């Protein structure tokens, strides 16, 4: 029993007049996978920002080296209404079982937040074989760094970007130091680090199009950064997607970008960590 | 070698003039599965009532929260005679191996009780590939609560009933408290309890026909019961059938009903247990 | 590379004039299986009698309840010569590895005993893919009860015999006492013993032809024997064949008979064991 | 993406004017398997001799009973240049992971040694699906018995040679002593030793052509050698190829010869070891 689900996008009014937030989507596995990623990074509390145009989940990883911004725009889901801008806090372990219980048989997820129950976030999963709606009442808080969202504004245009598959990235970083990323016109991308037993190891990408690399680096100006390999390896081990887009800045800042469906998964790792 | 077995039903006389009870049936696995159920409930002694029209096996589970009545009517088996009404006691561990030794190759089970051997119950299994009859002499006692059979008389007409599969019931009750069953005309069946980590969880059945639900509850009168979830979960873990029919009473009484073939398996869980 | 092997039988002269015994056969697995049987019975020394017409291997099992006579007649093998009647002793553990090394690729086994090497028994296995002959020099002794061979002479004609498969015999004896074998004209074969937890158990074979049973018991004279079930169960666990013929005597004596190919495997269990 | 690789052989000049050695080959698995063999023999340091015509890897096994000479001639690879005769030392554990990381997806291996980096040996592996070159900088030494290469000159013409598969050799030597190899015209090859429990065991090869045996032994002169079976068994357990050619000398010297592709793998075991 697979119904066809209309995609309505942002609505001007909610279906229930008491809803501060109404969300529904026909791919609930994005939420299961989002929360596997949070578990792998050992994020303890997930902060949520709801807005008339999108819902955003935020957390540092446990090491605090990296920050995750997961955004779902309302125009890309089946049903989205949010009255205004508000914030919620969700303890990750509390919702872990629920999100893990989703499988490929769940055809829908609905999330409701009502003015008259400000400490509750309702998650609704419908099974359409027998028409049973299953609801979880997840207690949430309001917590009122800050803006790393600037790093991923439409305009912050990074000079060096490419794409790895989960396989490629985990092969590269297979064997307590840094890895140098260096480029250049003709752009051989160079990656160098020390592998097992202090052996100097070098990868050279001769074809920018096979790894979908783009560069805005001026012809003869060199780009070289030194980033810590332990942070990269942990982000690789934690991936839930098949592909990441890596974006690099001259001061060493790194943005990892994965897309699931309506979900845009951004992981920022700035070079300011001691 | 599969013979065709005539179904004769209740006979007016036995084949052996000394038989107080003669039973035979062409689906011996019902007895294997009946006795797996008794083992799962850890019933220690199985009491038997034989009657000119049916044979009934009785026992409490080990917790005493539930009572099992398993009935096989003589009109539905291959061969049935009983001289009068009498009672026997069978120690479950004593017959456990025998009943577990049945498999899909057994085409017949015969049970004989003779006046001149009042402490013996004969079980006969025939293998028709080589025409060997194998007989067990099971020592039995006569023990002379009482009538919970009233709860399942033809007339005790419960206002709320539905059907779950083994899968559905075990999914519902997957994660030390009670579960509220509530209904209402339009009947959304509501089930609510606390799941992992004190999360309020709610199942709502919008289609009465997909779970084969029937209700005799008057239009606007509410039906709500509170029953202990530990007793339900143990009955679910113990099921040997694929489907149960759940019947509910306004005072919280519950009757679970499974059918194997000629065997009707009833499990009663009244709301009087402290 | 499978050659065709001529079956010559008993020859009047050996190929090598110094051979006291020359044997060869195109089914060496009979020897592997014979020696698995000896290992299962934990026979320590295997005695061998060689004769112008046949070779015989003899041993008690470790319990001494049973005696094994394994005979290979020279007329049924590819090549057989024996000068006269002589005896050899073979330590079983010494040859166990060799006999276990045979597999379905061995197409031939040759055994040679020469006058000038009276403490040596030569075993020769040929691999015809590359034409390599592999030879083992097995040191043997000469040891010069006695005649249980009388029990299995052509004339000792037992009143009750039948056949079980390995499966049937192991099912019958599946669960420290005796088993009664009883018969009778119309011959229902009856077997009775105590199964698990002192339950009296009875098997009745209504069709003599499905178990290939023959009886020479006079019409109305009863035949009943009591034999120890532990000895039977050990012979069943030790079988290397798919079928045994059971032969019974009125004093309780039992002969088990299996055939491999040219090998006749007899196991005698007389009722004189305390 | 499988390109076609030109085989150019020895070049008169290198592609990079600073190369003392340039090697490349389109079967990098020969190097993986060469280094599995060295690991199995527990060779600690691998010595390398580079020459305008070939590259040679040398090491004793850990027991020092055997010496390995692995030669790759430049005329048989895709690209080979060497300026002169020079020697390098490679610690085996240091390169073990790298060589083990090769799989059937590697289509190329390049090895470069440059005058201006005399302590470095560069290994380059190219992945042609995405055009990434991966390079390892392996630190090497220069170490400046000696000539066992004489044993395998074109002219040292051994009187007895044959071929075993890995399977055959490991079956022969399946079960602290010596094994005698003896021959003779008509050449039955005889092999004799003591197998399990002091049993004299003899293999006789009646067909010289099925094991590809050649002999230059004069008609009636006997050839017999006694070699230690422990050294043979260890070389068998260590094989990485499917076939070895065994060459024998009258003083007991043994040469084992395997070919991978361009790699000739020679293992010498002279009879001078105490």
Author numbering:
A (entry chain A), B (entry chain A), C (entry chain A), D (entry chain A): 17 to 160, 167 to 197, 200 to 208, 212 to 301
Verbatim from the authors:
The E301R protein (pE301R) from ASFV was previously predicted as a proliferating cell nuclear antigen (PCNA)-like protein through clamping DNA polymerase to the DNA duplex, but its exact structure and functions remain uncharacterized. Here, the crystal structure of pE301R revealed that it is composed of structurally similar head and tail domains and shares significant structural similarities to the DNA polymerase processivity factors, including sliding clamp and eukaryotic PCNA. We demonstrate that the protein displays a ring-shaped homotetramer and functions as a viral analog of the sliding clamp. Taken together, we revealed that pE301R functions as a sliding clamp in ASFV genomic replication and can be used as a potential antiviral target.
To gain insights into pE301R functions, we determined its crystal structure using the single-wavelength anomalous dispersion method with the selenomethionine (Se-Met)-labeled proteins. The residues 15–162 and 165–301 could be observed in the density map that was built in the final model. The structure contains four α-helices (α1–4) and 18 β-sheets (β1–18), which could be divided into two globular similar subdomains (named as the head domain: α1–2 and β1–9 and the tail domain: α3–4/β10–18). The head and tail domains are connected by an inter-domain connecting loop (IDCL) mixed with a short helix (η1). Inspection of the crystal packing of the pE301R structure revealed that it could form a homotetramer ring with the neighboring molecules in a head-to-tail manner, around a crystallographic fourfold axis with pseudo-eightfold symmetry. The assembly of the tetramer produces a central channel of approximately 52 Å in diameter. The homotetramer is mediated by the interactions mainly between β9 in one subunit and β13 in another one via multiple hydrogen bonds/salt bridges as well as hydrophobic contacts. For example, the side chain of K148 of one subunit forms two salt bridges with the side chains of E230 of neighboring subunit, while Y152 of one subunit generates hydrophobic aromatic stackings with Y228 and F223 of neighboring subunit, to stabilize the contacts between the two protomers. The inner surface of the ring is composed of the 16 helices (α1–4 from each of the four protomers) that are oriented to form a central hole that can encircle double-stranded DNA and allow its sliding like PCNA. Inspection of the charge distribution of the tetrameric ring revealed that its inner cavity has a positively charged surface distributed with many basic residues (lysine and arginine).
